[PDB]
């Protein structure tokens, strides 16, 4: 995010009507996959070439995948597998899609595989860490994980509450860690979704369970790392914590007015958090970036 960049735009030939990015994902190579208005698209950052995706027929909300890049063919073929799904869709009647090669071709995935399931679909995930395919399945106010593969085949994890929806973040190194967060809640999983537990907050060296909705804080952004987790709460709050085995402990950082309605945080490196805000310049139409 050095220098100034013009905002990313649709070329307008392949008019996609509204241009709302429901999700974005970094596939192997120079391609980036966007879900715009329920349709998949691929953008090559070295070019300006936009390619619509033909495999996905029904509208999809999210594209999910896992990326390894140890230098070999293995992490490449691991990166190729992808899922396309509509988050929140009815368990039966929604159509899930799978991609065997990058994101280039998408094939519909057959129902018989999950008849034994009824309810909303929080997400479908390929868990290469556990060599397992896990579906986040919401059958009531509580949500669970189901694993399709032999051992545990159709084995339910321990249920966790799930009012509203959640966004799922997978840790890069396939250690098995997961972050499920929305505006009013943040759940973490040391396991691969089997046990989903609240985060513990440290205040004056006493640790206690944290419920975001209970404390009335509204989280505006989250930054996720291989071993670490931070989030910025809309009322100028910043929490940093170390996600690990035996639970996750989060400390509230000293106060600073870091929220400006365009700010977002990310982890540049282990131990370095970065607060980024695009400032708009009227004359040049290219945005400056205010970094802290």
């Amino acid at each position: 995010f050095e220098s100034s960049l013009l905002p990313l735009t649709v070329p307008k030939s392949l008019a996609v009507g509204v241009p709302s990015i429901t999700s974005a994902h970094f596939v192997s190579g120079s391609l980036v996959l966007f879900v715009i208005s329920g349709k998949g698209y691929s953008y090559d950052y070295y070019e300006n070439t936009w390619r619509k995706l033909e495999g996905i027929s029904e509208p999809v909300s999210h594209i999910s995948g896992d990326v390894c890049c140890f230098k070999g063919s293995f992490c490449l073929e691991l990166s190729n597998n992808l899922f396309a799904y509509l988050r929140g869709g009815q368990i039966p009647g929604t159509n899930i899609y799978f991609s065997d090669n990058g994101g280039f071709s998408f094939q519909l995935m057959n129902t018989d595989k999950l008849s034994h399931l009824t309810g909303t679909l929080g997400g479908i995930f390929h868990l290469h860490s556990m060599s397992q395919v896990g579906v986040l399945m919401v059958e009531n106010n509580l949500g669970t994980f189901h694993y399709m593969e032999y051992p545990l085949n159709h084995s339910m994890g321990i249920a966790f509450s799930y009012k509203n929806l959640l966004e799922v973040i997978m840790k890069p190194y396939q250690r098995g860690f997961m972050v499920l967060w929305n505006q009013k809640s943040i759940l973490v999983s040391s396991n691969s979704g089997q046990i989903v537990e609240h985060v513990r907050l440290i205040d004056q060296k006493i640790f206690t369970d944290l419920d975001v909705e209970h404390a009335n804080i509204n989280i505006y952004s989250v930054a996720s790392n291989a071993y670490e987790l931070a989030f910025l709460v809309a009322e100028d709050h910043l929490y940093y914590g170390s996600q690990s085995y035996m639970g996750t402990y989060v400390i509230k950082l000293p106060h600073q007015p870091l929220w400006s309605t365009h700010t977002s945080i990310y982890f540049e490196d282990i131990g370095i958090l970065q607060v980024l805000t695009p400032v708009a310049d009227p004359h040049f139409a290219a945005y400056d970036f205010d970094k802290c």
Binding site: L152, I158, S190, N191, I195, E197, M246
Partner: protein, 55 residues
Amino acid sequence: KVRCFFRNENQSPSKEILGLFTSGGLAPNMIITNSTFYGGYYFKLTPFSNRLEWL
């Protein structure tokens, strides 16, 4: 035959600690020692879907 459970700040048996140690692939060991004896017995790894404690 013995039933054993890991004890933390919660004195009662907990199905989360068992799940954690089983999902890492860790199970307890019993070490029986004497003046002239040393023996080791391993608790068999089992899913924590039902078991509340090691046996």
